[PDB]
Amino acid sequence: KKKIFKPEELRQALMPTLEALYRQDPESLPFRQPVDPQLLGIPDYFDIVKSPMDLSTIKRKLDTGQYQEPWQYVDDIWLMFNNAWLYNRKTSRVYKYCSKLSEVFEQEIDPVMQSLG
Ligand SMILES: COc1ccc(N2C(=O)CCC[C@H]2c2nc(-c3ccc4onc(C)c4c3)cn2C[C@H](C)N2CCOCC2)cc1Cl
Numbered sequence: 063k064k065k066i067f068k069p070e071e072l073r074q075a076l077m078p079t080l081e082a083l084y085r086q087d088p089e090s091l092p093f094r095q096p097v098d099p100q101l102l103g104i105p106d107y108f109d110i111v112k113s114p115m116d117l118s119t120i121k122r123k124l125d126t127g128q129y130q131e132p133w134q135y136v137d138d139i140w141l142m143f144n145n146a147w148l149y150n151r152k153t154s155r156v157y158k159y160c161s162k163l164s165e166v167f168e169q170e171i172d173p174v175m176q177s178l179g
Pocket of ligand 1: 088091093097102104145149150155156159
């Protein structure tokens with residue numbers, strides 16, 4: 063159902079789910095900044111991931127009120143996870159850290175979504 067949200071109320075409801083990802087150490091560390099394929103020596107990264115997303119991009123979008131609806135925020139979190147599972151091998155540390163972050167997110171986001179509508 064349609065609902066108009068104030069960015070300030072989105073920010074205050076959704077920020078805590080984002081801060082819960084940030085406090086996962088070491089599991090959030092790969093996700094805190096945009097993937098720099100050159101710095102990381104993964105030059106195939108942009109062949110595989112066409113919509114990169116990371117926690118700092120998501121935090122900037124919350125702080126500039128670029129999310130109109132909660133589901134847009136969730137879509138960016140899920141894009142970030144999907145990108146990491148897609149690029150990384152099932153056996154790799156970043157894949158497992160991604161899986162850990164998605165479990166934390168799933169537990170944090172369920173009640174916040176209920177409370178927004
Ligand atoms: C604490 O965890 C790590 C420490 C180093 C590394 N790294 C490596 O093992 C070798 C490459 C440099 C570093 C590193 N890799 C990646 C990496 C790689 C592939 C990826 O696909 N999708 C994503 C997101 C992604 C990220 C990131 N990094 C930097 C590493 C996490 N830093 C460690 C602590 O300071 C800030 C970040 C990875 C992790 Cl999980």
